[PDB]
């Protein structure tokens, strides 16, 4: 996790890649940008103070702007890999390899709590009609197939609503956690630079005060650009999990609902084939077979 709060004591605080090191020691701030850790801890080369600040900003920029993708997760355009270390999301056997952990686990790795996404078996529809009038039989069939359609629409809404309430919320939390993590980094680096500027006494000290006073603006500009990548990553990851993992589970139960419902309907028709002409039956058979062979695609609002 974000290891608490940068000390207000105005001492020489350094950066660490150990979360434990940061919890125990007040003068140590957890960070997940290695080139920043090195630059900040190393300190300035001689009186080249201005170049030290400028390096910290460049390295902060290169580190926080990093992004990649995974071909098999075709609907996530933006993956920000340092989220793993920022949020202490680690997978056993993938230490230092968040991106490889994500290739094998999937976006589900990002969630604090894996949710259960299996669905109950979806009971086949039934048919009550005992009349033998032809028009009441055709309508009974036409209602059946309309009820069959709705079942797909209903189960989809149900999975989308579970997702909105228990899965999407976890991803959005991750955004807000990264937002606080990145503000923390920006404040820690600002506190270190200011401390070192106070001690600095080089001949350009007055000249460079404007640029050093622009540090927080500059770093927040970079954090905001990283947050744009990160929110896109969380948005695309959340939707990917809904549209694949959670809805594949619905599609699985509904295809089985379909085989059972078709069989219920086939038997109803056969029992009432006295009352319908060979000509009409040739058409219902193939209408039914094609309605049940074309599955209902997922969509939501």
UniProtKB/Swiss-Prot annotation:
The gene is tetX. The lineage of its organism: Bacteria, Bacillati, Bacillota, Clostridia, Eubacteriales. This is Tetanus toxin heavy chain. The chain holds residues 564 to 864 of 1315 of the full protein. It comes from Clostridium tetani (strain Massachusetts / E88). Signal peptide: none annotated.
